[PDB]
Amino acid sequence: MPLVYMNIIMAFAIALAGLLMYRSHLMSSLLCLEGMMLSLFIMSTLIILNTHFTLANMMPIILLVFAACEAALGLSLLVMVSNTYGTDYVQNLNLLQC
Amino acid sequence: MTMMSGRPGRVPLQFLPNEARSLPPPKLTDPRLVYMGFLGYCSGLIDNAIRRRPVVSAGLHRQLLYVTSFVFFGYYLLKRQDYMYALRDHDMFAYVKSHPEDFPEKDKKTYGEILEEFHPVR
Amino acid sequence: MTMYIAFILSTIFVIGFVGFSSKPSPIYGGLGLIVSGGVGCGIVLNFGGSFLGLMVFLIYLGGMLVVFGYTTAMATEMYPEVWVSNKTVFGAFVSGLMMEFCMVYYALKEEEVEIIFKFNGLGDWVIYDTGDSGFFSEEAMGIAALYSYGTWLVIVTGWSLLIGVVVIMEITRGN
Amino acid sequence: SDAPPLTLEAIKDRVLYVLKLYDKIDPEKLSVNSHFMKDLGLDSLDQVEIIMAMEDEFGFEIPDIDAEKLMCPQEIVDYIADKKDVYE
Amino acid sequence: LLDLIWLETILPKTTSFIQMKMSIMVSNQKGLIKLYFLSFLITIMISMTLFNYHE
Amino acid sequence: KFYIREPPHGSPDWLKVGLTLGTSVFLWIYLIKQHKEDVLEYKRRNGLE
Amino acid sequence: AKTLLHKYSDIPEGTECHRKAYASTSIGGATGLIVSAYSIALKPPASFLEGVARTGRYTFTSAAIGAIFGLTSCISAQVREKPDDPLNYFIGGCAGGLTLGARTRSYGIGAAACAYMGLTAALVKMGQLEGWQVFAEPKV
Amino acid sequence: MNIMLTLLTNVTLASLLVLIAFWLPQLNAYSEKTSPYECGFDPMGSARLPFSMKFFLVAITFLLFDLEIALLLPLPWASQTNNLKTMLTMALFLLILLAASLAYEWTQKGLEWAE
Amino acid sequence: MNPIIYTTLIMTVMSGTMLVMISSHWLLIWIGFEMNLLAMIPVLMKNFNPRATEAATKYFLTQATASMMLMMAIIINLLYSGQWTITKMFNPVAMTMMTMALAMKLGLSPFHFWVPEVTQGISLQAGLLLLTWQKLAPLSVLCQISQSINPNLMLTMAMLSILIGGWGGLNQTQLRKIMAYSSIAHMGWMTAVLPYNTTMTILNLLIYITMTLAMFMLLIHSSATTTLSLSHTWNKMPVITSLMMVTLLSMGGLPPLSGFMPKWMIIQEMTKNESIIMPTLMAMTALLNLYFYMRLAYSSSLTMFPSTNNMKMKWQFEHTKQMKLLPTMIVLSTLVLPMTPALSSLN
Amino acid sequence: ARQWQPDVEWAEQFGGAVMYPTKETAHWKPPPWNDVDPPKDTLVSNLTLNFGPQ
Numbered sequence A: 001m002p003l004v005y006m007n008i009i010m011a012f013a014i015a016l017a018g019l020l021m022y023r024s025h026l027m028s029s030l031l032c033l034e035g036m037m038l039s040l041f042i043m044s045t046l047i048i049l050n051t052h053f054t055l056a057n058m059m060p061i062i063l064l065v066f067a068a069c070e071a072a073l074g075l076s077l078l079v080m081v082s083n084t085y086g087t088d089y090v091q092n093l094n095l096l097q098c
Numbered sequence B: 001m002t003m004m005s006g007r008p009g010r011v012p013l014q015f016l017p018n019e020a021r022s023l024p025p026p027k028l029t030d031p032r033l034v035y036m037g038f039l040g041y042c043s044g045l046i047d048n049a050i051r052r053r054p055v056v057s058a059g060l061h062r063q064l065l066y067v068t069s070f071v072f073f074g075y076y077l078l079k080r081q082d083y084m085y086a087l088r089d090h091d092m093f094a095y096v097k098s099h100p101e102d103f104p105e106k107d108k109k110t111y112g113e114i115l116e117e118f119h120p121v122r
Numbered sequence C: 001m002t003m004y005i006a007f008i009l010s011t012i013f014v015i016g017f018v019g020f021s022s023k024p025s026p027i028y029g030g031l032g033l034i035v036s037g038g039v040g041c042g043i044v045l046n047f048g049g050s051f052l053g054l055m056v057f058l059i060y061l062g063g064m065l066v067v068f069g070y071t072t073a074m075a076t077e078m079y080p081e082v083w084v085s086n087k088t089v090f091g092a093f094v095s096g097l098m099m100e101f102c103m104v105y106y107a108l109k110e111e112e113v114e115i116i117f118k119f120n121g122l123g124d125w126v127i128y129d130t131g132d133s134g135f136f137s138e139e140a141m142g143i144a145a146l147y148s149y150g151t152w153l154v155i156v157t158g159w160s161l162l163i164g165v166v167v168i169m170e171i172t173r174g175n
Numbered sequence D: 001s002d003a004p005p006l007t008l009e010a011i012k013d014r015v016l017y018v019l020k021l022y023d024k025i026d027p028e029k030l031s032v033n034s035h036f037m038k039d040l041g042l043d044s045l046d047q048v049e050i051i052m053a054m055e056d057e058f059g060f061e062i063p064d065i066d067a068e069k070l071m072c073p074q075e076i077v078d079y080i081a082d083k084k085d086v087y088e
Numbered sequence E: 001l002l003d004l005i006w007l008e009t010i011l012p013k014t015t016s017f018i019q020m021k022m023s024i025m026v027s028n029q030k031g032l033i034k035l036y037f038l039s040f041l042i043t044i045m046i047s048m049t050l051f052n053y054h055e
Numbered sequence F: 001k002f003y004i005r006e007p008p009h010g011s012p013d014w015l016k017v018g019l020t021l022g023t024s025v026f027l028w029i030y031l032i033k034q035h036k037e038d039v040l041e042y043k044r045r046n047g048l049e
Numbered sequence G: 001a002k003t004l005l006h007k008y009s010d011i012p013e014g015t016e017c018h019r020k021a022y023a024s025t026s027i028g029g030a031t032g033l034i035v036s037a038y039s040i041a042l043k044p045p046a047s048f049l050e051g052v053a054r055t056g057r058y059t060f061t062s063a064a065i066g067a068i069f070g071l072t073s074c075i076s077a078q079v080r081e082k083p084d085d086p087l088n089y090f091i092g093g094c095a096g097g098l099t100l101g102a103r104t105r106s107y108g109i110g111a112a113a114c115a116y117m118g119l120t121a122a123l124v125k126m127g128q129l130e131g132w133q134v135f136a137e138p139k140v
Numbered sequence H: 001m002n003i004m005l006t007l008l009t010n011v012t013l014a015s016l017l018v019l020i021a022f023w024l025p026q027l028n029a030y031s032e033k034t035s036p037y038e039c040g041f042d043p044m045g046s047a048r049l050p051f052s053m054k055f056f057l058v059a060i061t062f063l064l065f066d067l068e069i070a071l072l073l074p075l076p077w078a079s080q081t082n083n084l085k086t087m088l089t090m091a092l093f094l095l096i097l098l099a100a101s102l103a104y105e106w107t108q109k110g111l112e113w114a115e
Numbered sequence I: 001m002n003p004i005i006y007t008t009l010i011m012t013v014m015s016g017t018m019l020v021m022i023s024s025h026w027l028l029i030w031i032g033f034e035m036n037l038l039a040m041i042p043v044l045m046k047n048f049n050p051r052a053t054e055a056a057t058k059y060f061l062t063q064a065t066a067s068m069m070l071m072m073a074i075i076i077n078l079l080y081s082g083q084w085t086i087t088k089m090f091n092p093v094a095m096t097m098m099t100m101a102l103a104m105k106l107g108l109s110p111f112h113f114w115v116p117e118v119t120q121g122i123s124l125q126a127g128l129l130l131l132t133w134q135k136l137a138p139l140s141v142l143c144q145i146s147q148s149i150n151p152n153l154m155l156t157m158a159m160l161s162i163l164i165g166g167w168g169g170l171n172q173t174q175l176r177k178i179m180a181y182s183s184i185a186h187m188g189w190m191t192a193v194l195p196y197n198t199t200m201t202i203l204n205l206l207i208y209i210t211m212t213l214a215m216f217m218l219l220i221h222s223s224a225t226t227t228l229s230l231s232h233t234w235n236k237m238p239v240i241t242s243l244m245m246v247t248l249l250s251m252g253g254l255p256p257l258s259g260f261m262p263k264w265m266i267i268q269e270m271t272k273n274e275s276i277i278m279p280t281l282m283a284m285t286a287l288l289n290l291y292f293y294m295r296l297a298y299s300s301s302l303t304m305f306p307s308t309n310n311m312k313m314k315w316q317f318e319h320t321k322q323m324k325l326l327p328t329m330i331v332l333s334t335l336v337l338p339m340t341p342a343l344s345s346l347n
Numbered sequence J: 001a002r003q004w005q006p007d008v009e010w011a012e013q014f015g016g017a018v019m020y021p022t023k024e025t026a027h028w029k030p031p032p033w034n035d036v037d038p039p040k041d042t043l044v045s046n047l048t049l050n051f052g053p054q
């Protein structure tokens, strides 16, 4: 493979680890989700352009649309959490246990 | 893990291929159909009991509908099940016929010439 | 071999990903994501995807502006954190930088299977196609095919967008 | 679990600690039965500061009417024990 | 000694004690997503190495 | 006896009862006809009768 | 990784006790490291040094259990001149259980670990002998 | 190649202007001069305190409506297809749902700012 | 929520699941999952409270992470083969990502932590939907790619799911958490047999869905969410408690009840593949689920707990809303063992 | 003589937030009867601004 493929894959891995490891702010994790989506977009676009598969040139656009849907969902949930607690910290979300 | 879904010439969403019509339909007094009707009757009785109605006598039309629906569905369920088992046996026999070298017929010996070990009980 | 421009752009992409993945204040996280979006746009441009890279840049600019507004609304603190104002954030940033350095070194100086498979490098120019024809852009034709080939995709996407509007309004209602 | 079952001895030790940390009191001439106004020579304003230090130490507010009665460390310990429901 | 104590101790009481301890260990979580997603990262790292390298 | 509406009054809902009975009768007749057709088709396919 | 299991199983049963003990120690150390990682993830140790201490105690206990089991099993197999015998694995498992009980300093834990670990090791040896499969392939 | 040179030149010129502005004049910085400005007085609180956003709902809708642009920008190329009836049907269908989404948020008081 | 809006959201959830069901393209399956999650998030928050908000947030985070892993696996599979069809993945790493993603979507161990909390934080109707309908799509995807799964990872996750479900259910007094741990254990049982026979997985899915629907409807009818609240139902609706006790015995897998048949068929199918140890451990561990079912039955129907004085006023009122399918679900959850050979119709 | 039935003390074993109460989970409190927690006094401070004199 090209080394750019490894760079994009490691970008995805770093963003996934950033999401999986949580600091105080909820907003930081949403940004990590958006970063994973961006890396997926870049990787899929590179794969589609390299192989000249004409019909999937539209697939990353659909990816972006559902990324926007995910981001809107996350922001709405953050609005409700911050309205409840006055802060978007994840440690406030501990009313429910296992 | 998926045995017969990819069988050739399988129409996706029929629930009853035309070849199934070559098989004898289940009798209307089939014990499995009687059990389906009994299940419908139990459903009717439980429906009466939950709604705080006389369990045995309250809804006669409702119990009749319960039994009829259960029997109606069970008839087609039994048809499909019998057809699927018929397909299984047909495919098994065809495969056995087409591969004689994997299912050989070896001569069987009589018990007077087979030596079995004896284990005394004591 | 040839100027390794896309290699530098992808390294900056990874650097920005480490920047917003160490999770400083969301202002700096959004700045890092904007830098990553721009360098990814450049990467995609270098392989002939002008429309896709430019579109993702535009979309992420809008998203990060909304994210900046929301950060000022609901994600502030008295002392917003930078990559050097906290031991944990700085440690994560340095660890990401050195992990990328180790991967790159082990990638170009010898041939190893990191996670999936191996590779030697040789630059991106090798895997090209040298195809010579056309009064159009194949990317543009493939994207325009969405309105003639992808009717099903358009239907599901429009339904999802309308449902998303309804969903955000349902969630933010309260009571 | 939460904090251990606080006892009288710990309360008394903490009270004497915060009193010995107060600069207008002799570290060795102070006793659990010393009277602030008479034994230590402290002014009423000084006493108010001491009550405020107790409120900081034990993490609960004290009204003025209760504070005016508190004229020695033993009374402070007894008041804290009564408010926190500590028998020993 | 045997029926009321040791036969009780070996089969049923040991089972009850072990299951109670394991249930307490499993179900006593603080409800913080930080710890859960850290464990998710650990699990992902294991599956890709102890399983994904063996085929 | 009862004070208020009591939606089931002394008479039953004849529309609902009639619909239920008609559904049961139609299902039974359809099942009988289906079974007869199945038996005839099975006999004709295998040359029994 | 199952490569550690193969490095343990590549050595014959009653030969090269030091190498087999080293392999079992490595397996135990890996298991203890995984256990400590999960324990730290799900129950924060409130300090970096306390987490390091918990990792050390878990890993050392598991590595000691593996070392004792492997050494005892190999020594018993070679002294008794009885390879392919579940008794050696039972003896090693009880030795590891006694090691665990001494580590936790609990007589009941020691006895229970003896019994259960020895039975499990004997069962594993029986499965190796007769080819029992845990994660069986989908043959049919 | 040319665009990278142009961007480099522009950024270099801007940075050089900053450098000239910051190293040429005489600087006399003291605490009163560099303090935060609120027209005569010291601020009561911090400028980093949470600042309420009364248009928070329109901000989320902007995210979804911005991706409508991504789906609609290939339209000039789509007009060159042979099956113009299908493309026109799908293009009009997409805008109709965008118009209906705006109508839904308008009629349910979603465009009014929080009070 | 406007009833029209609620109907539209439920239909959107169902249509996303069906899109996952009918798609031949990986992108369309991903789109179906995205639409399902988007329409599902508001349903968890229909009754607004901080607990519902927290449950929805945790659910969204978990499912979004799973979706990201799903898409990344799809992209790897495309990279190593220019294929979009869901037939059999061509890369082991991509397949491992796919398995981890689908297990996180299903809530299999060790990705189980979200299920009890989300189930507890929502209402009983949302819990019913979450524990019945949300399992269909990932299970269908796993059924389509069954020949490609690594048996070791799948079976490890299934065994962990069964063990953790039993142990977690042992410790619960809230009914929703009990049902969530029961769901985790049943998912483990279902995924244990998937590499060998997908028909067994489908049969287990159908029976588990029937029992769970009956149990949730019985819990809605007697509006209780704790053990002690359900302990009062005997003094108002003894028939409901008796049906609950019989359904609980069925869920424990005791013969001749229905819940026994999936375990029986799974065990025999696994023994066909020379798998003996793991089914034995699986049944011996499902003993724990039976134990806490029996504890609930002891507290609910087999003994009579003390009641309150105000129950006399409740004695005078009937149920205004009646559930139409509750009687059928109970009968199917209990008395369908003699109809076992009908499973051939599922393949 | 009558059959034994559970009483208040027996019933209270299942009234806790969790079975098998340990030292850490003893401070866990059962959730509210309806799934509604009481609102927190997290007062959002308004922003204070000096408008003028300059």
Ligand SMILES: CCCCCCCCCCCCCCCCCC(=O)OC[C@H](COP(=O)([O-])OCC(O)COP(=O)([O-])OC[C@@H](COC(=O)CCCCCCCCCCCCCCCCC)OC(=O)CCCCCCCCCCCCCCCCC)OC(=O)CCCCCCCCCCCCCCCCC
Residues within 6 Å of the ligand: B042, B045, B046, B049, B053, B054, B055, B056, I238, I239, I242, I243, I245, I246, I256, I301, I302, I330, I334, I335
């Ligand atoms: C295997 C081979 C075949 C076996 C068959 C399978 C087993 C039997 C069938 C199961 C389903 C059928 C019945 C279900 C609906 C009934 C629901 C009910 O509550 O009944 C109340 C009702 C009595 O109430 P009522 O008359 O309205 O007035 C009294 C008041 O209501 C006062 O009533 P109340 O409500 O106020 O009383 C309160 C009471 C209310 O509590 C109950 O009534 C218990 C009901 C539980 C429902 C059963 C679960 C669902 C079915 C699963 C069965 C599993 C079987 C497998 C083995 C496991 C055993 C558990 O609560 C309690 O007292 C606490 C009890 C808790 C102790 C734990 C035991 C409970 C569970 C035991 C279930 C055993 C199986 C069912 C046995 C029959 C029960 C009627 O019972 C009946 O009268 C109907 C029973 C059947 C009569 C129909 C027979 C047809 C007539 C003859 C025709 C001949 C046919 C052949 C022709 C031959 C030629 C001539």
Ligand SMILES: CCCCCCCCCCCCCCCCCC(=O)OC[C@H](COP(=O)([O-])OCC(O)COP(=O)([O-])OC[C@@H](COC(=O)CCCCCCCCCCCCCCCCC)OC(=O)CCCCCCCCCCCCCCCCC)OC(=O)CCCCCCCCCCCCCCCCC
Residues within 6 Å of the ligand: A012, A013, A014, A016, A017, A018, A021, A022, A023, A024, C018, C021, C022, C023, C088, C091, C092, C093, C095, C096, C099, E038, E042, E044, E045, E048, G033, G036, G037, G038, G040, G041, G044, G045, G046, G047, G048, G049, G050, G051, G052, G055
């Ligand atoms: C495609 C799929 C693949 C995806 C995977 C690939 C991912 C690549 C991306 C990596 C690039 C970097 C990206 C940046 C992510 C941002 C992270 C972040 O934001 O931090 C938030 C997080 C919390 O944020 P915060 O709230 O602001 O800080 C609060 C305090 O932390 C807490 O306050 P406190 O002080 O009161 O708490 C006590 C203290 C407690 O701290 C501790 O107790 C941990 C120290 C234990 C010492 C370990 C023993 C040392 C020796 C072991 C070596 C093994 C071999 C030994 C051989 C035999 C030995 C003779 O702190 C903690 O509780 C935190 C525990 C978490 C530690 C790290 C988590 C790892 C798993 C947990 C297991 C722990 C180690 C056990 C052993 C496991 C095997 C090595 O920060 C941290 O906890 C650590 C700082 C982050 C820097 C390290 C991150 C690098 C690790 C990433 C993955 C590792 C490699 C990946 C692939 C490698 C192979 C392919």
Ligand SMILES: CCCCCCCCCCCCCCCCC[C@@H](O)O[C@H](CO[C@H](O)CCCCCCCCCCCCCCC)COP(=O)(O)OCC[N+](C)(C)C
Residues within 6 Å of the ligand: B005, B011, B012, B013, B014, B015, B077, I203, I206, I207, I210, I258, I332, I333, I336, I339, I340, I341, I342, I343, I345, I346, I347
């Ligand atoms: C608790 C007992 C289980 C109850 C189950 C629910 C019962 C109500 C369901 C209503 C019946 C209608 C369903 C089907 C009717 C038409 C649809 C038909 O065309 O579907 C066909 C298939 O038919 C159905 O699948 C059969 C459904 C019958 C379910 C009963 C089996 C239950 C197991 C034994 C218990 C006995 C139950 C007693 C009845 C109450 C399509 O075949 P195909 O597209 O190729 O298969 C898809 C799956 N593949 C590809 C992966 C193989």
Ligand SMILES: CCCCCCCCCCCC(=O)SCCNC(=O)CCNC(=O)[C@H](O)C(C)(C)COP(=O)(O)O
Residues within 6 Å of the ligand: D043, D044, D045, D046
């Ligand atoms: C950070 C820099 C801050 C500096 C600015 C501070 C400015 C605040 C000034 C406010 C002044 C007041 O409130 S004026 C307070 C109101 N009145 C009086 O103080 C006089 C009457 N009081 C008495 O005579 C008592 O007997 C007494 C003598 C106290 C004996 O007390 P005890 O015997 O009972 O201990």
